[model samples]
Target: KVFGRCELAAAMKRHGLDNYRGYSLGNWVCAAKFESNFNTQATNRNTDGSTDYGILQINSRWWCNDGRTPGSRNLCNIPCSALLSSDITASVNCAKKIVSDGNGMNAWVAWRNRCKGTDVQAWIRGCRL
Candidate 1:
């Protein structure tokens, strides 16, 4: 499902990602904003053969098993397909694990280049619900 900015922000907040690992709400929202334009069915295959799934784009390489990634770590113990669709439970929980595994928000390259060192509230500036 495609999502609006405010709606997506509110949903992420309810999913317990607001301040997970001290990154704050907007930081996560920003990642999704540019990551997939808030598209739930977003999927992009990497040059390395792994695919990024869901709005937050969790990789099949280290987070979820895509059944095609040769050396998948499956650290989240979930299928890459679970990262797709409107329900973000699998994506959020796996993202928590990604952050906990020393990746921080840096797991998303877009987050590193586009989200880091920016106004934390700018991403969700007017979406305070």
Candidate 2:
């Protein structure tokens, strides 16, 4: 599912991403825009032979198992296919796992580069919190 800005905000907040690991809702919203534009079906293949999946672009190399990425850790203990579900449960859970695993929101390069230290609140200005 492709989400509009506020739509994605509401979806993610319901999953407890707001202020999760000290990262605000806007941080997640901003990163999701840069990561996959809030499209649950999105995937990106890296040159290192890893693939990123879903709305948050969880990495197959270390997060989800695709049965193809070499030596995948599957830290999220989920199939990469689950990441693409329009429901977003698996994707958000995996992302939360990543943050709780000590990576924080910094696990996403997009978040570090685009959302961190910025006025990320703009990303969710009109949303009902």
Candidate 3:
């Protein structure tokens, strides 16, 4: 995956799983392990002919709306980059609000499992962390 590690971290932070930091990185790693097998450049198809792209598998058409870039290249670009550049802390905090607020790691875990061929929502409702 071309956008692993930093990319996955960005998505985790974006999804508000930052609370899992310290130990979270491990969980993040595990999530990626399940999501795309640590592939930074993963892609998947969506119903509307859109697709999930990159490490966190963000939908290309759905996630990229600024008209900055289109198709596969846009997969490499997400709003988080500017935030990461301008202020990583602020950027991370912002992502955390959206992610944690949306549904936290449960969703991440579920998606990861789904990608990994684990056809159950176990990842969503379980985890001591």
Candidate 4:
């Protein structure tokens, strides 16, 4: 996909994800790890009849359109598949928009459940950033 943990962290930093909009790179890394394991093409179906797209696991219900989804807000104005690419620019830009439009990283369940308040240094232990 896009990147391994360290590489993803570096890319995030390069894209200004280190402290983007208010969320930490550690939290982003943690969420990405749990949500998609850094796999850009990752997709998950929710029991609520929605889908999560890309490494950030952005939801079709609010972020992107999968075409089959009936009620996508499509706030990013892009297809769901845009997030599922090796080029992470779309995902990164949309993620920033989500955090800005919503309540920061709290919009991501993975961030709230697994990343918020944890020891985050481990997410970048050997990255040498």
Candidate 5:
């Protein structure tokens, strides 16, 4: 398990996530809430047989390559299990690469569905940046 919203915000900011790849910290925070609720062990099996991993729910089909998953692009060159750990360093880095690839936070369906146009400021409200 990871920490709470504020702690996650602080960590993300410490990693320079307040404004990376032109995406707001609130966007990341809000997405995290809806995606995995700050749980590092979060996993969701998709209809296509791909699984999403960790806070950002990184996909196995194109991003990380878990040995159990077949025919993965593994563009991030990391295992899917790496995203499931309490240490988010690798997951954050991979998320950065995902955003930089021009998908922004839209790569996350949770972000697109729930947080896309919502008031995300609440996600970071009262957080110590």
Candidate 6:
């Protein structure tokens, strides 16, 4: 049988960043796949709303305003997800980036050392990553 929504959700949850996780990671992935085949540089415009870009579904317009230079694709048309490239592992590394204070991506480097296997809430309450 083909993989369904719940199965995909479980898989993505295993890779989720934190409680900040969205309503539907699978839908996000499916949208990405349907639009760009899970390409980090994915971009699309759904009838319902604005343009979707990147694995995080960030909008290019908002992202275009600042950070990182434009490429041959141009700022307005560049895919923000391309920032992480096609490396799924590196993509996953972003999990720690979004949740940390000060936008400090290095926080994850020390995260596992301080609380890899601990009870999540307990660790979160006591630890600082």
Cα lDDT of model 4 by residue, 1-129, tens digit = 857899899888888888888667888899899889899989999988889999899999988988877856899999999999998889999999899985888888988899889997689888968
Error of 2 at 49 (Å): 0.5
User: How should the candidates be ordered by TM-score, best one leading?
Assistant: 2, 1, 5, 4, 3, 6
Q: How well is each residue in 16-111 modelled by candidate 3, as lDDT tens digits?
A: 665453225445545555655655445566666655443444444533333433453332235523332322333334434434444655545434
TM-score per candidate: 0.95, 0.96, 0.44, 0.94, 0.95, 0.32
- Tens digit of per-residue lDDT, candidate 2, span 1-129: 899999999999999999998888999999999999889999999998999999999999999899889877898899999999989889888888898987688889998998889999999998877
lDDT score, candidate 6: 0.39
lDDT of 3 at 102: 49
Q: Which lDDT tens digits does candidate 6 get at residues 1-129? A: 122334423444566633333323433333333333445555565454445554444433333322343332233333454433544433344333443435332223233343334343432232222
Candidate 3 global CA lDDT score: 0.45
lDDT of 1 by residue, 93-117 (tens): 8888988877788878999999899
User: Which portions of model 4 show Cα errors greater than 4 Å?
Assistant: none
Q: Which is the leading candidate under lDDT?
A: 2
Which portions of model 3 miss their true places by more than 4 Å? 1-23, 66-98, 109-129
Candidate 4 residue pairs that clash? none
lDDT of 5 by residue, 5-115 (tens): 998988788877778987789999998988999998999988878899998899998899877667768999998999998888888998988988876788988899999
Query: Candidate 6: misplaced stretches above 4 Å?
Result: 1-11, 17-22, 43-57, 64-84, 88-129
TM-score of 3: 0.44
**Reference-based TM-score, model 4:** 0.94
* lDDT (Cα, 0-100) at 90 in candidate 1: 88
Pick the winner on TM-score between candidates 1 and 2.
Answer: 2
Please give the range of 10 consecutive residues that has the lowest summed lDDT in model 5: 64-73
